[PDB]
Amino acid sequence: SGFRKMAFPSGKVEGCMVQVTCGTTTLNGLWLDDVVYCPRHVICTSEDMLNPNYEDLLIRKSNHNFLVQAGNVQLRVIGHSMQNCVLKLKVDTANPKTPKYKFVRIQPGQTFSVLACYNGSPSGVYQCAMRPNFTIKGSFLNGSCGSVGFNIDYDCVSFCYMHHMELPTGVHAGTDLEGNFYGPFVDRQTAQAAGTDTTITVNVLAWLYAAVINGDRWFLNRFTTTLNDFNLVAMKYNYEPLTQDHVDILGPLSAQTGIAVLDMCASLKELLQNGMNGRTILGSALLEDEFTPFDVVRQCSGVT
Amino acid sequence: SGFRKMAFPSGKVEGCMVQVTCGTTTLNGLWLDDVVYCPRHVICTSEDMLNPNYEDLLIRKSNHNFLVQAGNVQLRVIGHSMQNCVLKLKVDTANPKTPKYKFVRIQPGQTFSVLACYNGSPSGVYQCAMRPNFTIKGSFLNGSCGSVGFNIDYDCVSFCYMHHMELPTGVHAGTDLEGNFYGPFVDRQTAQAAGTDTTITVNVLAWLYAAVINGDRWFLNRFTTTLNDFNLVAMKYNYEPLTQDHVDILGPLSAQTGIAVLDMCASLKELLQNGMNGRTILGSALLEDEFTPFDVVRQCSGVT
Numbered sequence: 390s391g392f393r394k395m396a397f398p399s400g401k402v403e404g405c406m407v408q409v410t411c412g413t414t415t416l417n418g419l420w421l422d423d424v425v426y427c428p429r430h431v432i433c434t435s436e437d438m439l440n441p442n443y444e445d446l447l448i449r450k451s452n453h454n455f456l457v458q459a460g461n462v463q464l465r466v467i468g469h470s471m472q473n474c475v476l477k478l479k480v481d482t483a484n485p486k487t488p489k490y491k492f493v494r495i496q497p498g499q500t501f502s503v504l505a506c507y508n509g510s511p512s513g514v515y516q517c518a519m520r521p522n523f524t525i526k527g528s529f530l531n532g533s534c535g536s537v538g539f540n541i542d543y544d545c546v547s548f549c550y551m552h553h554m555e556l557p558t559g560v561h562a563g564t565d566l567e568g569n570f571y572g573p574f575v576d577r578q579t580a581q582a583a584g585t586d587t588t589i590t591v592n593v594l595a596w597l598y599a600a601v602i603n604g605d606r607w608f609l610n611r612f613t614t615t616l617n618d619f620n621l622v623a624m625k626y627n628y629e630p631l632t633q634d635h636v637d638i639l640g641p642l643s644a645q646t647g648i649a650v651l652d653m654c655a656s657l658k659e660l661l662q663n664g665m666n667g668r669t670i671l672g673s674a675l676l677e678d679e680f681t682p683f684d685v686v687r688q689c690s691g692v693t
Numbered sequence: 694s695g696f697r698k699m700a701f702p703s704g705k706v707e708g709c710m711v712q713v714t715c716g717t718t719t720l721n722g723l724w725l726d727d728v729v730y731c732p733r734h735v736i737c738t739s740e741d742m743l744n745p746n747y748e749d750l751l752i753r754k755s756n757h758n759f760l761v762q763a764g765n766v767q768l769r770v771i772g773h774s775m776q777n778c779v780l781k782l783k784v785d786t787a788n789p790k791t792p793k794y795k796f797v798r799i800q801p802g803q804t805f806s807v808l809a810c811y812n813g814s815p816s817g818v819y820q821c822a823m824r825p826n827f828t829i830k831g832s833f834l835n836g837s838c839g840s841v842g843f844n845i846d847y848d849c850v851s852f853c854y855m856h857h858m859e860l861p862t863g864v865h866a867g868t869d870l871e872g873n874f875y876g877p878f879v880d881r882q883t884a885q886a887a888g889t890d891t892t893i894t895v896n897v898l899a900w901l902y903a904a905v906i907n908g909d910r911w912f913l914n915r916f917t918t919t920l921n922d923f924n925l926v927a928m929k930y931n932y933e934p935l936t937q938d939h940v941d942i943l944g945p946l947s948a949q950t951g952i953a954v955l956d957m958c959a960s961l962k963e964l965l966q967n968g969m970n971g972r973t974i975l976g977s978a979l980l981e982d983e984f985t986p987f988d989v990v991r992q993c994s995g996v997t
């Protein structure tokens with residue numbers, strides 16, 4: 390029992406973190422095989438960031454201007470190229486610690502772990518979700534760029550995120566490992582609007598299922614509702630619409646607890662309409678939406 | 694910016710996790726040098742746990758009855774001994790992945806990361822605190838015993854906790870790496886009372902400092918208070934008494950924000966007396982007490 394915001398063990402990713410310096414800018418790189426991946430804004434000076442022309446800035450850079458250091462050892466850069474918003478620096482040495490890996494572009498509402506890094510050294514690991522507005526509520530300071538988000542399936546690391554930016558509002562923006570930003574964000578120091586941050590309904594419900602499994606059942610009522618009735622309430626409270634796919638995905642949680650998905654929907658409807666009345670659910674005084682049904686199942690079954 | 698419950702990177706500890714089987718019981722072990730540390734209740738059958746006599750149960754066990762498996766390789770057990778509530782199994786091979794390490798007994802209110810494991814394989818990592826009642830609010834399932842809690846100082850892992858038990862209330866009890874339980878708990882399947890779980894006041898204040906640093910400043914008022922006036926309010930709300938040592942420890946946070954510790958105390962006093970009024974602080978609708986002043990400083994400075 391117990392429910393915590395749990396991250397994947399970071400060992401496989403720690404073995405991939407390197408430092409990338411270009412000019413006066415230092416950030417993190419991801420070394421997999423003989424390629425180091427990093428945000429392309431490593432080639433920018435703080436003056437360039439207002440309106441960078443990355444192709445022109447990159448023309449002035451050669452392989453020897455990219456300093457890549459793995460631990461205390463310097464890697465030799467034999468090639469460099471830009472793929473969307475990431476640079477791929479080909480090095481002469483394959484990372485001996487390269488785990489089995491994939492690059493995946495995740496959907497909003499999906500969760501992943503971040504290994505926050507500074508100067509190629511890992512400082513911490515935390516779990517977060519890709520928000521419906523394509524931002525992440527991370528914890529990143531100066532030099533954290535290049536830090537990655539990932540999931541692990543037994544021994545295969547699916548890298549899904551690379552940190553690039555912090556918006557004026559303190560939320561974070563980044564790309565997948567092919568350099569495509571999640572959202573409408575661009576790697577420019579300009580006024581960028583995040584958009585409405587809605588609540589991931591299927592995740593709140595999965596967390597209500599974990600709460601029931603964990604003995605916290607005060608919020609369960611004698612009511613049911615329909616997908617349409619529920620979604621009328623969900624829209625008013627800036628919650629994502631619940632679809633039949635979400636209901637299907639909650640099936641194992643519904644089967645384990647014996648609580649039909651629509652019955653749990655009615656409990657959530659009353660929690661939204663009446664608030665928590667000073668009470669807590671799983672030690673929280675608000676509805677948590679950064680646990681997918683896969684995360685709840687995993688944390689309540691023991692998958693290593 | 695951003696504030697998250699951040700754990701230490703778990704790589705150094707993942708390299709130490711092994712599986713320990715004795716009879717029909719399998720749990721996790723910590724392999725450091727040529728010794729595997731594990732809960733002594735690995736020698737108990739589910740019938741023995743009502744009132745085990747560990748010395749007598751241990752007499753019936755020989756080195757060959759302890760199956761230790763590191764990955765898919767079996768380790769040879771050449772010695773076994775009991776130290777308080779832990780078994781120390783001497784193996785013929787030193788762990789090649791042994792990091793620099795120490796064994797430390799932590800104080801209540803101190804935080805640490807847990808690498809939750811099952812069958813010697815790491816499944817997740819999360820951050821928690823040793824509660825003032827010497828329990829931990831973990832997330833552990835069947836087979837999680839032997840999972841460890843640690844802190845990292847650059848390259849030195851200080852192991853502080855080994856998981857042993859789940860109380861009937863769902864909170865967790867365990868020992869330091871010398872086998873001494875934190876609290877009055879005993880490794881027996883018996884009715885054990887946890888005690889009053891008070892709030893770690895110095896940690897709530899450190900988190901209020903992180904909130905101010907992170908732009909969440911609504912709760913700051915025009916008032917101050919005294920250590921004695923504050924503690925009168927703290928006692929009523931089951932908060933730990935704040936001492937001059939706690940005030941000293943908050944010094945760097947007070948210096949960085951320009952807010953005197955007693956002024957922050959008055960803000961917390963009003964938050965306790967009036968509640969949050971439906972508002973949030975760092976994305977939470979309750980006062981968080983599992984971030985020490987060292988954690989807040991570390992997460993707001995970038996220590997790797």
Ligand SMILES: O=C(c1cc(=O)[nH]c2ccccc12)N1CCN(c2cccc(Cl)c2)C(=O)C1
Binds near residue numbers: 554561577579
């Ligand atoms: O290192 C950071 C940084 C990242 C972060 O998440 N939090 C911080 C908090 C305090 C100070 C700095 C940071 N930078 C430099 C690059 N950078 C940027 C600026 C413009 C465009 C692009 Cl793609 C990137 C940033 O956003 C800011």
Ligand SMILES: O=C(c1cc(=O)[nH]c2ccccc12)N1CCN(c2cccc(Cl)c2)C(=O)C1
Binds near residue numbers: 833835836859
């Ligand atoms: O593996 C677990 C377990 C640990 C846990 O933290 N959560 C669980 C949730 C569901 C089912 C089992 C568990 N056990 C076996 C040993 N055990 C025990 C019993 C008596 C004494 C001693 Cl020292 C230990 C337990 O408390 C329970």
